[PDB]
Design an enzyme around this catalytic site. Sequence first.
Site, short mmCIF file in Angstrom:
data_model
loop_
_atom_site.label_atom_id
_atom_site.label_comp_id
_atom_site.label_asym_id
_atom_site.label_seq_id
_atom_site.Cartn_x
_atom_site.Cartn_y
_atom_site.Cartn_z
N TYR A 617 41.11 32.93 41.29
CA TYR A 617 41.15 33.44 42.64
C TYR A 617 39.78 33.92 43.05
O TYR A 617 39.30 34.91 42.52
CB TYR A 617 42.17 34.57 42.77
CG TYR A 617 43.62 34.12 42.63
CD1 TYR A 617 44.23 33.30 43.57
CD2 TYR A 617 44.39 34.53 41.56
CE1 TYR A 617 45.54 32.90 43.44
CE2 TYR A 617 45.70 34.14 41.42
CZ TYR A 617 46.27 33.32 42.35
OH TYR A 617 47.59 32.95 42.18
N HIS A 699 47.61 35.49 50.29
CA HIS A 699 46.96 36.78 50.48
C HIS A 699 46.29 36.93 51.85
O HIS A 699 45.27 37.58 51.97
CB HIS A 699 46.01 37.02 49.33
CG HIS A 699 46.71 37.01 48.02
ND1 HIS A 699 46.06 36.82 46.82
CD2 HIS A 699 48.02 37.14 47.72
CE1 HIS A 699 46.94 36.84 45.84
NE2 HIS A 699 48.14 37.04 46.35
N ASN A 746 45.14 41.23 43.59
CA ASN A 746 46.23 41.00 44.53
C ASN A 746 46.41 42.21 45.45
O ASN A 746 46.59 43.32 44.97
CB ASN A 746 47.53 40.69 43.78
CG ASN A 746 47.52 39.34 43.10
OD1 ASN A 746 46.78 38.45 43.50
ND2 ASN A 746 48.33 39.18 42.06
#
Length: 805
Positions: A617, A699, A746
């Site tokens: 990510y 996200h 996250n």
Amino acid sequence: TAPKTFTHPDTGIVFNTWSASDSQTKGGFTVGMALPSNALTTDATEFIGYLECSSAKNGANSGWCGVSLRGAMTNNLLITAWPSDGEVYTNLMFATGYAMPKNYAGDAKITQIASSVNATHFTLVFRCQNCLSWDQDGVTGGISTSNKGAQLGWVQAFPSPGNPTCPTQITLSQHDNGMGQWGAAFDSNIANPSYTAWAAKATKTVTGTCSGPVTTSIAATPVPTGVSFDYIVVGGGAGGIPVADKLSESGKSVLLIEKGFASTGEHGGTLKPEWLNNTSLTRFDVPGLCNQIWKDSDGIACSDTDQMAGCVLGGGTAINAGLWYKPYTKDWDYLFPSGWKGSDIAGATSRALSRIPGTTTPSQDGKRYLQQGFEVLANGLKASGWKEVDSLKDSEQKNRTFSHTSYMYINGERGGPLATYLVSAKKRSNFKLWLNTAVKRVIREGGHITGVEVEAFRNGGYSGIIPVTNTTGRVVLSAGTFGSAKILLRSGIGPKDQLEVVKASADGPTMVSNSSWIDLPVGHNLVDHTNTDTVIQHNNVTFYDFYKAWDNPNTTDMNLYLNGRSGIFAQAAPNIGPLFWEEITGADGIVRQLHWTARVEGSFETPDGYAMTMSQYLGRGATSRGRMTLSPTLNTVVSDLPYLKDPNDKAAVVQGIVNLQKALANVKGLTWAYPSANQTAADFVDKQPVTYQSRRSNHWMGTNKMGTDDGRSGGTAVVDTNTRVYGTDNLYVVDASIFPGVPTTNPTAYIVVAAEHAAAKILAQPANEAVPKWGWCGGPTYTGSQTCQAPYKCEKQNDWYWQCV
Ligand SMILES: Cc1cc2nc3c(=O)[nH]c(=O)nc-3n(C[C@H](O)[C@H](O)[C@H](O)COP(=O)(O)OP(=O)(O)OC[C@H]3O[C@@H](n4cnc5c(N)ncnc54)[C@H](O)[C@@H]3O)c2cc1C
Ligand code: HEM
Ligand SMILES: *[C@@H]1O[C@H](CO)[C@@H](O)[C@H](O)[C@H]1NC(C)=O
Ligand SMILES: *[C@@H]1O[C@H](CO)[C@@H](O)[C@H](O)[C@H]1NC(C)=O
Ligand SMILES: *[C@@H]1O[C@H](CO)[C@@H](O)[C@H](O)[C@H]1NC(C)=O
Ligand SMILES: *[C@@H]1O[C@H](CO)[C@@H](O)[C@H](O)[C@H]1NC(C)=O
Ligand SMILES: *[C@@H]1O[C@H](CO)[C@@H](O)[C@H](O)[C@H]1NC(C)=O
Ligand SMILES: *[C@@H]1O[C@H](CO)[C@@H](O)[C@H](O)[C@H]1NC(C)=O
Ligand SMILES: *[C@@H]1O[C@H](CO)[C@@H](O)[C@H](O)[C@H]1NC(C)=O
Ligand SMILES: *[C@H]1O[C@H](CO)[C@@H](O)[C@H](O)[C@@H]1O
Ligand SMILES: *[C@H]1O[C@H](CO)[C@@H](O)[C@H](O)[C@@H]1O
Ligand SMILES: [Mg+2]
Ligand SMILES: [Mg+2]
Ligand SMILES: [Mg+2]
Ligand SMILES: [Pt+2]
Ligand SMILES: [Pt+2]
Ligand SMILES: [Pt+2]
Ligand SMILES: [Pt+2]
Ligand SMILES: [Pt+2]
Ligand SMILES: [Pt+2]
Ligand SMILES: [Pt+2]
Ligand SMILES: [Pt+2]
Ligand SMILES: [Pt+2]
Ligand SMILES: [Pt+2]
Ligand SMILES: [Pt+2]
Ligand SMILES: [Pt+2]
């Protein structure tokens, strides 16, 4: 009893008519008859009828009419009429008792002549052959026209029939709008020589359609009169829930409107796999069930967006894996303006972590499950000199670091805002919760929001306008990155072209005038983590299915969860292996964060079992941004992708994979499925398409960006440091949409922390006061109160200046 003569203006037919008074029914009712020439002497077998009936409320196409031919409802031929589509339908019915009548099987036939429908009445002129004598089962009835007269009953109803276009199959309840009968007697005009010519105008016919039952209706509750709120929060979610609670500690009245339905057990959710039936647990409650959202998502996820978002209580927190982290303080330092930096946010970070401490060992028996997969990678990494840290206390080590998976769970069920903030809030009397209710827009006179418009999304919910208590009342938009941007746009706040799209829609006649529009970059600065997947194998990898654990779960494990809150079901599907982090400096002198999560699953061609996928990510430090816009019917779309635009964003993704291969280079029996060992890392990353289906992390963030640079002045910020929308008095945004960029990890943790922080700033803000006559009430640089003392009105003076007048 005595007939009125009525000539039809259209067709030319003369009727005898009998009407009902204004007490007997409202909207009025009239019957009419036309008979053959010989009809006053010898019994006629046929007639031409006339119906003028009522639609009071439900009033477009609604209601139904009836006539009983010897006048009692029972053992006589009934004629039943009603509007739908703008035509008029009829059916011939026969009633034995005072229950619902059956269809009349017999020689009677109705064919139309003329018809009318409008907001007041529905009209019919029809021709009835063989209708003056009938037989059904053992019942003989009829009326003799030479009497001279007949008994006629009549009825009228408020609701329209069910299956309103299929006469044979209609559904009725008892007649509301009235009932009665006459002694109706005939006279000169009911027998005309012109009659047989009138009955040749019966050419017309109406088209019925059956099609089955209807799922469309959505019956709603209208909003309570004389009620208002100090705060109104829109949407339950990572931002919505925590802010609504913290506001509700103040004692001020708080309302939380949510488009979704009840999610978890505690809050009255019903959705479960067949093996949870005998408990109060629900599919959102069990962690190992969390991935089913990718199999069956219907009615759980938002239909007005092209992306994945939860419309359910808890929003994303209800459908996600629950990964939880103590926020890295450097993320605040880099992303946010002053007042939001690492040191200012420290206070609210402990408050959030107290209510939701999180755990590395979700199973309440005390240790973990199927960790063999985790072990391969965990040990392989510290072999290359990485360092195990606890992601829940020293958060400062994000460089060459791994940790055990950390969740938000509480007692081995899905943790987080639903289980804590929303419980302690519900206990309060000032707090109120509305579900199945969609906010369409906020209502505003100028830059001051008076109330919000709601539309029932599903059954329980409310329609109409709720006000905030006046002058002090505040609205907070928590409805998510796409949801909140949408509400603003429909509220006349945003880029012109997008507002035009709104004006051009079905919203347009009711939409705010453009004299009041506010130009802000709503929808700009869309951003997401950039996700890239790699695959490995080892013989040590223990695979667990989780997808058929829906239907046919492992019985040792089901009984272990249900009885003890333990087993694999108490950790996230799929089994999520180590989390690891790396920071990378690029040639542009930006440090880009990498966030790797490993789960034991098969990816593109590599089958499940033996296989672990590793998702990278690309986080904080990424420069690329996108944009969100509106479809012609106002669906939210991502029309500009925020992925891999800057060549240096792509360089870091490639670097990450290279570094990861070097760090896993010495490990026994480790395959690399992707990138395959004949392939270089750069070659692999380049074969990956940059498309939201391939690269999205779910996200999504940043569409109303918080900053100190007012948007109306050609700056980039939609909301200021207090999270209030520029150009407004009372209007706030608390949720992921204000984040100027993505954090390391996250985002849910970062969002709840941010909701805590905002509710403190909001509360600290002084009460709003109405502007006196002649005072300054608005314009492009104006930051103060937007509402006038009454009677006075905000009026525009220059292009730059509004004053109270
Ligand atoms: C599939 C998926 C997986 C995820 N996995 C993780 C994860 O593993 N770890 C992690 O930390 N985060 C995860 N998240 C990301 C995280 O949950 C989101 O960033 C977070 O939910 C943002 O919260 P929010 O309050 O901004 O919006 P949301 O959480 O989406 O809440 C918005 C709420 O507002 C309501 N609403 C929307 N429109 C209206 C309307 N007009 N009227 C009234 N109410 C409305 C919505 O129903 C929803 O309830 C995941 C998200 C998704 C979608
Ligand atoms: C399911 C729908 C219907 C229900 C439940 C229903 C029930 C009744 C009941 C219970 C009464 C009077 C009670 C009593 O006499 O003790 C009544 C009266 C009447 N009904 Fe029906 N009815 C229905 C549909 C209709 C239809 C289709 C017609 C004819 C078009 C009709 C025409 C009348 C008339 C004219 C009266 C007053 C005269 C009388 O008592 O018979 N009703 N209705
Ligand atoms: C609707 O039609 C009825 C009779 O068919 C008539 O009396 C009434 O004026 C009409 N309504 C309007 C608004 O014209
Ligand atoms: C669980 O409850 C649902 C709800 O009606 C039902 O359809 C299903 O048959 C039940 N399963 C059982 C009892 O095993
Ligand atoms: C694989 O598992 C065995 C025991 O199951 C263990 O001894 C070995 O260290 C594991 N391999 C790696 C690379 O950790
Ligand atoms: C992260 O670690 C690597 C390797 O130790 C190092 O080269 C790099 O400078 C570090 N970055 C930061 C910001 O400390
Ligand atoms: C506002 O709308 C009207 C038409 O509805 C349009 O003619 C006018 O130009 C608009 N205002 C601006 C500033 O464009
Ligand atoms: C169910 O899980 C247990 C572990 O708790 C395992 O020992 C058992 O073999 C599993 N059953 C099947 C059919 O795989
Ligand atoms: C509050 O509302 C009333 C009527 O809507 C208005 O006359 C009054 O002036 C408002 N409050 C203030 C402080 O002006
Ligand atoms: C609004 O009205 C509905 C009826 O459609 C009720 O069922 C609900 O409880 C709410 O009060
Ligand atoms: C709105 O209408 C309601 C009916 O429930 C009343 O209670 C209230 O006083 C206001 O007139
Ligand atoms: Mg009645
Ligand atoms: Mg995840
Ligand atoms: Mg489109
Ligand atoms: Pt006569
Ligand atoms: Pt039909
Ligand atoms: Pt209430
Ligand atoms: Pt189900
Ligand atoms: Pt930096
Ligand atoms: Pt309660
Ligand atoms: Pt109002
Ligand atoms: Pt049980
Ligand atoms: Pt670029
Ligand atoms: Pt996906
Ligand atoms: Pt403060
Ligand atoms: Pt302005």
